[PDB]
Amino acid sequence: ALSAQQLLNASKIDDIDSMMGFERYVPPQYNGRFDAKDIDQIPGRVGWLTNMHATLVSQEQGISGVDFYFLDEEGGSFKSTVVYDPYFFIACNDESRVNDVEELVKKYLESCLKSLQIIRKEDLTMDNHLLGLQKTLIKLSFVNSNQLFEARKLLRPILQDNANNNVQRNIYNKVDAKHLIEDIREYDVPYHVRVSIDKDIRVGKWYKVTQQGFIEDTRKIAFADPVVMAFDIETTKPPLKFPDSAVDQIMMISYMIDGEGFLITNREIISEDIEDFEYTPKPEYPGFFTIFNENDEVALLQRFFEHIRDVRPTVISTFNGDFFDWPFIHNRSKIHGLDMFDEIGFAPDAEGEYKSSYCSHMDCFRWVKRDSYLPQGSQGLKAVTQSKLGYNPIELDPELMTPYAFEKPQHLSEYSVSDAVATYYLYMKYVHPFIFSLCTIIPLNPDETLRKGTGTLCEMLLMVQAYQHNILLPNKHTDPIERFYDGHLLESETYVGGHVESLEAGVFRSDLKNEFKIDPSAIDELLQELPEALKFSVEVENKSSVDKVTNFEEIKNQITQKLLELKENNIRNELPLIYHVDVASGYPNIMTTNRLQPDSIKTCARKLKWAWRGEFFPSKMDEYNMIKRALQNETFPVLTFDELSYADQVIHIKKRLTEYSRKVYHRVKVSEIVEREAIVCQRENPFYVDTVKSFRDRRYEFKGLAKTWKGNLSKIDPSDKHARDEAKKMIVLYDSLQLAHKVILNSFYGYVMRKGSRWYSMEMAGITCLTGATIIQMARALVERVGRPLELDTDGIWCILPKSFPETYFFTLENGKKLYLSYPCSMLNYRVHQKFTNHQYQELKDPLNYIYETHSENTIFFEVDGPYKAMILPSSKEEGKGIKKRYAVFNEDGSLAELKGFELKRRGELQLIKNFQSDIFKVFLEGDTLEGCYSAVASVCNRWLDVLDSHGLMLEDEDLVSLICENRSMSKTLKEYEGQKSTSITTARRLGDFLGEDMVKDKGLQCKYIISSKPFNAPVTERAIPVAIFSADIPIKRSFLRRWTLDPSLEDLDIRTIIDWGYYRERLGSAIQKIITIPAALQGVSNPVPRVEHPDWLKRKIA
DNA sequence: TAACCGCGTTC
DNA sequence: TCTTGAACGCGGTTA
Ligand SMILES: Nc1ncnc2c1ncn2[C@H]1C[C@H](O)[C@@H](COP(=O)(O)OP(=O)(O)OP(=O)(O)O)O1
Ligand SMILES: [Ca+2]
Ligand SMILES: [Ca+2]
Ligand SMILES: [Fe+3]
């Protein structure tokens, strides 16, 4: 009888909705026809849909429905409710007796079943479905979702009893109605998702809510303007510890409402009363802040809640407020006798996040984590602000925040205000357009669209297409607890992914010549291919015709000439062209080209290859069962082995099968790779393929607008500062949008391996990867015969080409326009489209007679960027090994184009190494010769080497603690690391012993540590000191370092005598080895930093 | 030496 | 409850 709690919540929410301007609107009745063409004549109210939530109504037992929250055209708001019977299907293993099952379930489920009906859907796993045969199903409908769940608990025993055997009757011997029910289907669709899909309603669109239903008003283009508030709180904190919502108070709540800044203060903690000030960190971000200097903390909370209730916001934005700000305000409200739910309608939900019915909570940190495409080291609000808004917000050390309420109150008021400015404007410029536009195609509310994984987002879009094509949803995938290969227990199985090669290291600049040896037969091939490749660049790449171009021969003659000149002199020493070629939407286009989709893996048969890789124990079956019977006889946490769960059973089996295999085979795990083939039907209902093609086209629009505005900008004179400032803003705006669509797009590839995937196919994912590896290696084979490829990753190639190699040309058409042509790009694309096009792609031409056509499909194109000014690739310390996924590339104007992989970019590495790498990549541009180039990097190296060889005596204390520090995050809590050794685990354990157990209470703690010299010759994980120790009082300090260095002798407590300076001298040393010296050796110049000795294998090679 | 792990990247 | 994939670098431990 849980409807009590549910019907109550609906009443409470209904009243909270009314207080915030959302009273349930019921449209006037209409007896005329229901056509969208006469929208202006049908009685009703038009609004912009801003939110939606499942609810229970009481005949206006509970009745399932969805509240839809609207903003109307006349500055007001309202909500409307649609009711819809929840439902799922019953499948039968013989469609001749469906009416018998129908009579069974009508009586078996009569306690909760509302109505019943036989319907037909298309089953993609059913024979003859491509000819029109459909699966017959029983549609069970219910009054509310509680009744649906009851029928599930009632049907599950039947489904489990039919999968078990039968019973002991006359052993000397038409089937029961219960054994005919094969499975239940579409039983786990969220209700409001079910309503959103079935009724074709989306947040962000305009509707007219009439008696017949919602009529989309396609005349209304732009989004309505909700009132948006972003807030940030600041609280007191113990020195070197974390805020505790029990003890610590809230100093101030800064916020902003549609541009107007505000600030509530807690005069009981903030010493002064602050006057109205301004923070406009850039002209485009005004920030006039009105302050509410209040007395008590209760006064502060009550003004915040009162201000919320009066402005009536439908969007409240925060930065990580879901797991700090909101629970802090809620805990302070409870302590102070204020129920936050009665006040503002917010409350925690099942995941601990804070939501409301009328107002979406947009935690910008969720957007940053999923869609911003920033590295984790740049996901703090400070880095996000300078990357996305283009300015540096106000900083100050958090250790000084609790004191500065008393000492420098105005400065700390400026910080809290800058956080509110950065949060509000990042939401309005980035989070708000993206998520609300996303809601128009994904059947979720803004809160869910922001937070769900990209795989779940893909699943939502796929369920819309499947439903609209009457395709039965597959049930969620389930992986078996045990799988075997050749009798061996499998520990993990997967496929071979992308192909990555590190081919050359060192420095390559457009002003420094390189030596090329051009394969003459390679130029022979491109000459034979040149006529049809230029036609390909004209007709396929630029979608034109050779008839309308006027310099086809002139450009063909210009390329053949250069082609021929480079064939005669195949040995050259010229300046290079630093180029990058990269397939646009590689895996998506590989899928759509070959018609890849889970339901297509089974002449409509396209056989494509993939590579399965398995990891299994060396033990065979004879030893498996031996360990099992052993584990069976032992006791467990009062319980037997067979009385455990199958999961806990295999847990113990795996633990004891690792120990055995180690002591008998010397190994614990064997890996093997087998080439597998799969049949890809080229006629299957392409609802999956088409969904990918649609979203890829969606992303392509923003990707092309970024390229346009990168062109509009360079065509603007450097003097027009305002024009070029606005062009650069659209550039970062469209780059952000296309990057936000990139992860969702590629999750269509990843979704086929996601746990619980409705369309799981390991085969399809492997085929995509192997096909990509085959294309990118064919491209390398041509580049290595024409130039020198430097690095290669999955679908991209960094290479240098002779300056004499044919480069960029522009066709001219009789219109007067121009067609762009990059010959290094089109020469590869022509080969792409000669060796990899799918000539077996089929589509329904006549659906009524089920006749198909067969056409040729290939949307795989390399895209080129460059030529660049410099590329700097590091080398490995070990002989012959390269360094993949790490380099630096610079533009012609000297700016950094790409910085990939290096510690400078990663979250929390050795800070000294970050500043070193930061100071050094710029200087690889200096110098006039390659040897002179390496001397400029040598000087900055020797500067950093000097700081360490001097034991940091040439830096002030605070710069030293900043420099030698290393920060590392612990993804889990310490207790989850039992049995493991690490510098983070040590730092966290020592932080807990000195600062208290509550320091490790939560996951994600940043362990900032220093590595001590003593105890000597001890493992490095034992000498990691929390840097917090040196800010504690001298008694508390000394006791712990004496403890941690095992030196009761010790009282020279200064950092410079504790640090293992030789350790950091090695860390910097190998950094200098990999970036500077070892690549310099591989380019043939003597060690530019002789204070960093070469490897023994490298010295021997120099002989 | 080589297998192995956690973190965080590049695709 | 939720829940895209694999390849890779590096500091560190372990067999
Ligand atoms: N985040 C991801 N999740 C799943 N697969 C990914 C992800 N990122 C990259 N991949 C895979 C699929 C991509 O097609 C393939 C090539 O990477 P990349 O070239 O960076 O993306 P892309 O080719 O789709 O975009 P672009 O058009 O910008 O090159 O790597
Ligand atoms: Ca803050
Ligand atoms: Ca790509
Ligand atoms: Fe087929």
Author numbering: 31 to 90, 112 to 224, 232 to 660, 676 to 710, 720 to 1185
Please give the exact wording used by the authors of the publication that reports this structure:
At the eukaryotic replication fork, the family B replicative DNA polymerases epsilon (Pol ε) and delta (Pol δ) synthesize the leading and lagging strand, respectively. The exonuclease domains of family B polymerases have several highly-conserved motifs (named Exo-motifs), which include the catalytic residues (D290, E292, D383 and D477 in yeast Pol ε). The catalytic residues serve as ligands for two metal ions, and substituting both D290 and E292 with alanine abolishes the proofreading function of the polymerase, which in turn increases the in vitro mutation rate by ~100-fold. At present, many structures of family B DNA polymerases with proofreading capacity have been determined, and their overall structures are well conserved, consisting of a thumb, palm, fingers and the exonuclease domain.
The catalytic site of the exonuclease domain is supposed to harbor two metal ions, which are essential for the exonuclease activity. The published Pol ε wild-type exonuclease domain structure, solved by Jain et al., only possesses one metal ion, located at the B-site. Within another project we solved a Pol2CORE structure of a polymerase active site mutant, Pol2CORE M644G, which has an unaffected wild-type exonuclease domain. This structure of the wild-type exonuclease domain, solved at 2.5 Å resolution, contained two Ca2+ ions located at the A- and B-site of the exonuclease site. We used this structure to assess the impact of P301R substitution on the exonuclease domain and will refer to it as wild type for the purpose of exonuclease domain comparison.
